[PDB]
A paper describes a structure:
Full-length constructs of Aim18p and Aim46p possessing N-terminal 8X-His tags were insoluble, but truncating the N-terminal mitochondrial targeting sequence and transmembrane domain for Aim18p and Aim46p (Aim18p-Nd70 and Aim46p-Nd62, respectively) dramatically increased solubility. We also generated point mutations of the CHI catalytic arginine—Aim18p-Nd70-R123A and Aim46p-Nd62-R107A—to serve as experimental controls. Each protein exhibited robust thermal melt temperatures ranging from ∼48 to 67 °C, indicating stably folded protein. Interestingly, catalytic arginine mutants lacked this golden color. We used a fluorescent heme detection assay that uses heated oxalic acid to liberate the heme molecule of its central iron metal, generating a fluorescent protoporphyrin molecule. This experiment revealed that Aim18p and Aim46p coimmunoprecipitated with bound heme and that mutating the catalytic arginine significantly reduced heme binding. Alignments of the Aim18-Nd70-R123A and Aim46-Nd62-WT structures with the bacterial protein revealed that, while the α-helices differed substantially, the core CHI antiparallel β-sheet was structurally homologous to the core antiparallel β-sheet of cytochrome c'β-Met. Of note is a region of the Aim18p-Nd70 and Aim46-Nd62 structures that lies in between plant CHI α1 and α2. This region contains an extra loop that is absent in plant CHI domain–containing proteins but is conserved across multiple ascomycete Aim18p and Aim46p homologs. Nearly all of the CHI catalytic residues are substituted nonconservatively in Aim18p and Aim46p except for the catalytic arginine, which is invariably conserved in fungal homologs of Aim18p and Aim46p. Although our data show that the conserved CHI arginine does influence heme binding in Aim18p and Aim46p, it is most likely not the only heme-coordinating residue; future experiments will be necessary to fully understand the coordination environment between heme and the CHI domain.
Numbering used by the authors: 83 to 321
């Protein structure tokens, strides 16, 4: 009769709240996802706001953080461990350093089979071309692009075909990007005016989803600094 618990948060007041939990009954996704980080995304020096971003982690994959980033990882890949601090304190410190070693850590997490969602909600009317191009720009900032140029190019072509729908996207619509355990991407669209979902294409090339979500979580110039900041803090609590 009297619901008393908050299940969503207002990432940006111009669009609808982001749910803390996304299940296969709410969206066309494969498992239960929990909000990890969130924030607004801006572009260019004019700080032009383009969308609100929600990053989600599969509930059943929360164990993968500590299974991957542990005291073994720490001494295997770092040679500057402060022995006065615990392993989790050192791992947290190194993740917050926000340097090339932080990227390595996030990339290793992504290789562990960690399943994720990105919910992208435009704050103005746009179109699928611009959403797609924004993902390409993000992917292209990953530090390892130059060492995987040809394979990545094949993946970016898959990304074009994955955007099966063409045309307008309304403010407050949702693009849903799901990262599968194997690294593939599944795309989906939510028409919020008519409350209709359209499943779109897939990208099976692993580099695409790996580079995209790595840049969301730890990019030097990430699309949403606040989503990066909140997601990293939340990942640290799972150590």
């Amino acid at each position: 009769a009297f619901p008393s618990h908050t299940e969503s948060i207002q990432v940006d007041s111009s669009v609808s709240d982001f749910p803390l939990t996304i299940t296969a009954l709410n969206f066309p996704v494969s498992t239960t996802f929990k909000l990890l980080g969130y924030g607004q995304a801006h572009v260019t020096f004019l700080r032009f706001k383009v969308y609100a971003l929600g990053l989600y982690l599969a509930e059943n994959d929360e164990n993968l953080v500590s299974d991957t980033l542990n005291e073994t990882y720490l001494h295997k890949y770092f040679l500057d461990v402060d022995d006065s601090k615990t392993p989790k304190e050192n791992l947290a410190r190194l993740l917050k350093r926000d340097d090339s070693k932080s990227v390595m850590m996030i990339d290793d997490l992504l290789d562990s089979g960690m399943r994720m969602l990105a919910k992208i909600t435009p704050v103005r009317n746009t179109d699928f071309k611009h959403l797609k191009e924004g993902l390409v720009k993000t992917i292209s900032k990953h530090p390892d692009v130059a060492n995987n140029k040809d394979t990545l190019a094949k993946g970016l072509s898959e990304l074009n075909d994955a955007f099966s729908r063409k045309g307008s996207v309304r403010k407050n619509d949702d693009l849903i990007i799901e990262l599968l355990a194997n690294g593939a991407l599944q795309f989906s669209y939510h028409d919020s005016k008519n409350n209709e979902f359209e499943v779109m294409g897939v990208v099976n090339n692993q580099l695409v989803g790996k580079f995209l979500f790595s840049q969301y979580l730890c990019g030097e110039k990430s699309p949403s600094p606040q989503a990066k900041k909140t997601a990293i803090d939340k990942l640290i609590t799972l150590l």
